[PDB]
Each structure stands twice: as structure tokens, then as C-alpha cells.
Symmetry: D3
Subunit: 53 residues, 6 copies
């Protein structure tokens, strides 16, 4: 299956909208961690914000 890669693609658009001019880092380090958590169960806007810069 290709579930997480398909989930990744929507989660960066959500971090571009949530994060704004603060931006975000989607790097191998703490980006496999937003996938472990937000592609397993639905993350709210405030849980998404904790990955912002």
C-alpha cells in the first residue's frame, strides 16, 4: 500500500495553510513523526500547529 505517501501529500498542504509566514520544516527527522501520528488518526488544527516553525 501507498497510504502514508498519499497522506504526506495532504499533510504538507495543511502545514502550508496552518503555518502561514512562520513556515515549517518537513525534514526526515521530525517529519516521520507527524506522519506516524497524523496519518494514523486525524490530527486537529492545533496538533498540526505544533509542527510549525
Amino acid at each position: 500500500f501507498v497510504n502514508q505517501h498519499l497522506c504526506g501529500s495532504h499533510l504538507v498542504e495543511a502545514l502550508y495553510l496552518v503555518c502561514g509566514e512562520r513556515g515549517f520544516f518537513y525534514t526526515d527527522k521530525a517529519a516521520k513523526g507527524i506522519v506516524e501520528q497524523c496519518c494514523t488518526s486525524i490530527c486537529s488544527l492545533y496538533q498540526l500547529e505544533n509542527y510549525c516553525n
Copy 2:
């Protein structure tokens, strides 16, 4: 018109695909170079990879 925000929305999706495992950082102060270049001309995928982590 929100020309920057609509071009920036496509650019984050193109970067998720081209950077793959390298990932990237999208700071609105690091996102100025890649919007100024790639929203006024079509960037190759090699050009996009120059912004990967």
C-alpha cells in the same frame, strides 16, 4: 490577487515529491527565492531540488 499564495501552494506539493527522503524547510523568508524564481518561470525538477534538505 493572491498570486504568491496560489503559486506557493503548488510549490510545496512539488517539493514534497522531488525532495522525497531529503525533505525541505519552507520558511517564508527562505520561500522568497523559490517563489520569485519559480512563480515567474517554469522551474525544472533539477532546479526545484536545489531547495531540498
Copy 3:
């Protein structure tokens, strides 16, 4: 106008995300309205939350 058509396709997705469970209507009166407000210059997340139900 096609640039308003395309902006509105991105606006439908951001309201889906911001409005969570609540949802939103995209009747041709709220549409005209969010289009004029938020495709002419950017909208913050508060502003978009105001169109949600």
C-alpha cells in the same frame, strides 16, 4: 474569470480543513463574498473560519 475559478478551487479545500466537523455551505452567495474577500488579498484563518457553519 478563470483566475477566480482556480482560486475558488483552493478556497473549497481550505474551508474543508478549517471548518472541521462543522462543515460549510458554498452556496452561490457565500461563494461570491469569500471569493471577493479572499482571492483579492490573503485571508487569515480567523477570516476563513467566519464562513464555516
Copy 4:
């Protein structure tokens, strides 16, 4: 739960194209009948139009 969220995001972009200047409702009541029918099986464009306002 993330799978139906993923699906709903792509159905909102389909309803925006199919309904045109009609528009559509996508509140929690309105759009849960849609997801039951169109996220378990594939809906055509003629079935999606039933949900236009």
C-alpha cells in the same frame, strides 16, 4: 477516520467542479450521506450532481 477525511477532501474538489455556480452544502449533516455513498464505492459525476444546490 483519516481515510474518510482523505476521501472527503477529494470529494469537495469534485463537487466544486460539478456543481458550478449552483454550489453545494457540505455541513456535517449535509455531507455524511455523501461520504457514506461515495467513499465506500466510486460515484460518477451524474450521481455527484444530486448533491448540488
Copy 5:
């Protein structure tokens, strides 16, 4: 203003929508023809179904 490269990505999505397993027959003249006409005036789904195969 319409950036034609960002408009084309939306149009390729729409034809996937419209044509689905019918596909299309690719020729440079039809490709440039669709992006010229539907990136300057809005095309409806019934205009886009003409390009399906």
C-alpha cells in the same frame, strides 16, 4: 492573470475526473489547444468531455 502552468495542472485533474477509464489520445496540438481555450475562458465539464477518447 492566469499562470498557464498552474492552470494546466487543474485541467489535467479535471480530465482524469471527466474521462476516467475512457482516457484520451494525446497530440501536441490538442494539448496546447485545451490549455489555450480553458485557461482564458472557463470551460465546463461538457466542453472537457470532448477531449476524452
Copy 6:
């Protein structure tokens, strides 16, 4: 299940990007093949490049 129709919309977006102004070609067979291969495991951009014209 709608999962392969959803994967297929994301491949279309990644062939548009990768192929650029060369565009891509459709046949019944290759459309069956890239979904059975790229919706089962992650295809690179250098594998997708084989369907561009």
C-alpha cells in the same frame, strides 16, 4: 473501495509535473500497469518519466 481512484488522481498530478510540456500518453494497458505498480509501492519520479512523451 475508492483507494485506487484516489491514488490515480495523485499519479496524474505527479506525471503532469514530471513530464512538463512533453505531456504523457494513455493506453488501457499502461494505465492498468502504473496503478498496479505505483499504488502498491512508491514509484520514483525516474520511473514515472517513462510515461512522458
